[PDB]
Symmetry: D2
Subunit: 351 residues, 4 copies
């Protein structure tokens, strides 16, 4: 080699910084590649979780209908007597043998339900861990991009410093020493930027963690305390506390009795949601316990108060004047409120 001692020192600074630069770039490619495959694992797990979810919900309903039919009490006693309905001279019995198959099919169903609940649970943790890793990697990538900008600026200046030590000229040493001073100033700018980045990142996270010091009630309190605070309910009218405005036994009289917050002159049940909306009440398509269910059939319609909710297509209700019975109470048990002869259902909420 024709290398000097001073030139080797400059070469060492270039090789050290280049090593750091390549190390950052290698990790960037490493993390970006890991994220790509983890995002793919997640997508696949997500599709499988969706598949299991609908099956679990569907199978639960089937298992609850099959339980109800197998545990109705009043009709089940006859199903136990059907097995006993065979002893002496009845030709050929295949009722008891067929009873084993429906129980075998039943036991097979809950075992598959148990397996699906196990599988979705396992797929959830793996998916969640994959998603968490990807976010941590993305944060590491953001940190590396700032570090790379700094180290590449340092490398530039170091390479110019090496170019000065090699220079076989008085004219040129001076030229690239001006360029080195310029490059070193740029490297300082990059470092100060990275310092501000770390400074900002740290305080931002502390500000995020500080906001966790709260709860829902305080959060809901802040809405009503603000200017944009629910004041649409202020313009409502004070209604009567009794049902004297509705005739005895009617569905309207019944709902007014159970839900005294309803209006006094809201007419036929069919029009209650229409009048309630005008009065400032919130309406919607999903049942809530305590909400007034309003069915519109283009005629008189019907109203009731929701007493229990399992889904949008499965509720219980307390009502008056259903199928000729004018007493207030539970007339139907569980039923689907979207598929009745009273028509389009809409719910009126208290708040």
């Amino acid at each position: 080699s024709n290398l000097t001692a001073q030139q080797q020192e400059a070469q060492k600074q270039v090789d050290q910084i280049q090593e750091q630069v390549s190390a950052i770039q290698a990790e960037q490619s490493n993390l970006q590649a890991e994220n790509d495959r983890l995002q793919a694992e997640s997508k696949k797990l997500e599709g499988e979780i969706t598949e299991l979810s609908k099956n679990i919900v569907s199978r639960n309903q089937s298992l609850e209908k099959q339980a109800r039919s197998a545990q109705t009490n009043g009709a089940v006693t006859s199903y136990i007597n059907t097995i006993v309905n065979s002893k002496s001279i009845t030709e050929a019995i295949s009722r008891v043998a067929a009873m084993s198959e429906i129980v075998s099919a039943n036991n097979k169903m809950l075992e598959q339900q148990k397996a699906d609940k196990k599988a979705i649970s396992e797929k959830q943790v793996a998916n969640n861990d994959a998603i968490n890793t990807v976010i941590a990697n993305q944060q590491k990538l953001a940190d590396d991009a700032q570090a790379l900008t700094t180290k590449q600026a340092e490398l530039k200046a170091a390479e110019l410093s090496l170019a000065a030590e090699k220079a076989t000229a008085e004219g040129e040493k001076a030229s690239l020493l001006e360029q080195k001073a310029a490059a070193e100033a740029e490297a300082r700018a990059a470092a100060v930027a990275e310092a501000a980045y770390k400074e900002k990142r740290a305080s931002q996270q502390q500000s995020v963690l500080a906001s966790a010091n709260t709860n829902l009630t305080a959060q809901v309190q802040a809405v009503s305390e603000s200017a944009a605070a629910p004041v649409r309910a202020k313009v409502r009218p004070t209604y009567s506390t009794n049902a004297s405005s509705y005739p005895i036994g009617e569905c309207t009289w019944g709902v007014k009795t159970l839900a005294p917050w309803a209006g006094d002159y809201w007419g036929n049940g069919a029009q209650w949601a229409t009048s309630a909306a005008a009065a400032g009440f919130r309406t919607g398509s999903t049942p809530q316990v305590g909400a007034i269910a309003c069915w519109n059939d283009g005629g008189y319609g019907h109203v009731a108060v929701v007493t229990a909710v399992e889904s949008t297509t499965r509720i219980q209700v307390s009502e008056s004047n259903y199928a000729g019975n004018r007493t207030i109470g539970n007339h139907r048990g569980w039923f689907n409120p979207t598929t009745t002869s009273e028509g389009f259902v809409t719910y009126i909420y208290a708040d």
Copy 2:
């Protein structure tokens, strides 16, 4: 004579009652027909006013709010000072009077519609009530008419006996009178049974009013079944360590600790919640987890206020770059956002 007048008096008294019932039947039936028509017309007008009132309310809240949004009003005061620059014929301040005139005209029409619907509601309600009372009166009259017409029959035969002839015939229609009087007693016993039934049925109805919602809801859970799908629920962690700091999932888990621990990207929370046994739906409720699915990562938040399906407030984390938990948007429409299809997960 004299005895014949007494018989004639009984016929005329009962005939008077019979005609009175028939007159009232025609009276009530005619009143019901026109009241049912008045109701139908009022119903159509109430529907017309209702949609206008709701629509106009939304319009009135989109207006005024945009011209009185805290932060934005200072610019509206500067607009008059900026339009005052002499270049060169100014009609910006004069045109500002027209939008305020149009605004004031809108709330005055809203106030008139709320007044009109209120008046139409009471008239309609009274009309409906009157019709039902009349129908009950008509049912009572039909039973009374059957009785009085049977009494009239016997009374007319009694008069026919006093006019005599005499045969041969007195004895004949006195047997018919005794038969008619027995029929009249049968009609009376039938009307008594009718009143007996009507009275006890109404008492049974009035007895059922002695209740309230809580007792009603209690009877459902006390019955064989009875919501028992929530019994199989799981114990989730009480902290948000399973979700990364600043993410929307971490924020919702912080505000709604009843949510799951490994429910992944916000988009899939409703899907996992439904599998876990939670109830989901399309209408916002305060305290519900709003889950938006965009076919990607999606988003989650907790509903803090609800005015309608298309107007809510929420508290969330990581919205538009801001990773702190809080209110980021104010009032907004959750169905029309870049995070996609909204679904709500309810606590119970």
Copy 3:
């Protein structure tokens, strides 16, 4: 017996008519009982048909996703190479053994799908036959009620005729012979009513069968030929046939190119449904081929033209300016239009 010859003749008429009366009443109870149990069989079959239907639809989607993943072509070649990725010194392989289980699970799925399609088919015919029998019985019950009214009126008169032949009195024979003449007149009235019933029933059915002499086109023609005929589309404006009102490459320009019946000044894609509705176009939530899909995100939104539809949550579309690509064409393949970053989807229909 102290029975006369004439009295026996009267007694015979009573016994013959009573036999007919009891025969009708016996059949009424017979048919009413059969209908009750057939209505119950139907209800049970209906619930089972609903159960099978949702499973068949759900399982079809799963089988088509599992087929797609197992028949993607470009990624499947790697799945065939994974089995070949084992020969000499690889420790323990359970990738080929696990491949048998997913195929076993796949083959088990289509066999259960085939069994469910077989079961629903069988349950459909049994249910349909049960429903048909119940309607035929109801028609027979309507016929019997008319016949019963007639025969009971005949019985009344016959019993009075017997009461006249027994009568041991000059005073009473004459009385119940007047009652018999009255009863016979009532019996004639009942017969004439039953004749009118049969007369009406026969001609009504012929009038119903006559109305079947038609088809949809004639039916749709009669609507437009009537006074209540679609004339809301008359007030529309004639739009330009080119997309010069929209800038090159935009989504609006693309939709206008493929659907020239769209408007010229409808602005950002998000507002197209809003302007279309004002212009008199019909809008809705379900995709149709040739409909303009309008997504509203509270911003600029997006528009496209629907090119294929499998369900509400699965369509294909041709569009312009998707994910940076400004050419008109198919960018996404099959996708769910309700779950995208462009927001709330609404469809604008040509008619």
Copy 4:
């Protein structure tokens, strides 16, 4: 001198071009800001007018139609002749003028709103178009500015050489000029590549316009998949012998022979159709089978005309006791009937 003026001229010419670009950048950016604001305001007003126009159209069709329903107008002519009976101060004919005045006022406001939305649409559309054109011009200017500023640099160094001193220095900044001119050439080649790319991209976009819907739909079916779910469909009977005469099912089967043969009560038709591979949905289309489910027997019909989701006509059998096939209701709302939840089954 003289040579220095030539150098000064080159600096002043290029500086003029540089300032012209920068002036236009500020000009276009300012115009876009105010046009984006005009658009936002117009958008809100278009939304306001749209809902009013749709709402008012429904109101106008519920009105007039009720006062001009064939069969019902003869009674409206008799109402003036019946209110003319002298009993005793008549204000029924005078009040009839007010509802017609209110009606005529409604269509005049509808006509004004259709005029206003049309005008607002063109102004908004032109505003949006201008903004996009400006954004493209801004992208072009940024590339041109980079080039002209590089040319200016070299020209200023050329002027600095002619002023000289002279050293020692002429030679120094002539080397810098040669370096600057090389940089200016690099900027020009970059702008050329930009124009090269921009031009070919637009040609590729314009090329894709050479198509139509049919070719587009053809490419879907020609691709790997391609709707092939309809391939597995079944051959049903061509007559309605499987359904009893006069029933709603028999009627729909007669009009829509593509329906199934053993689909039972009308209520379950959508359920069986979905299992059979047919597409279902919540929006009416002409020729679709409407299936109403009331938790009981339900009802079916064939859609013959559609105005909206809440306004259709249908042809059906066995409606309100009438078992003939035909139009029984005219225009009606299929979501608000006593037959329950409506769902439509589509042919394809």
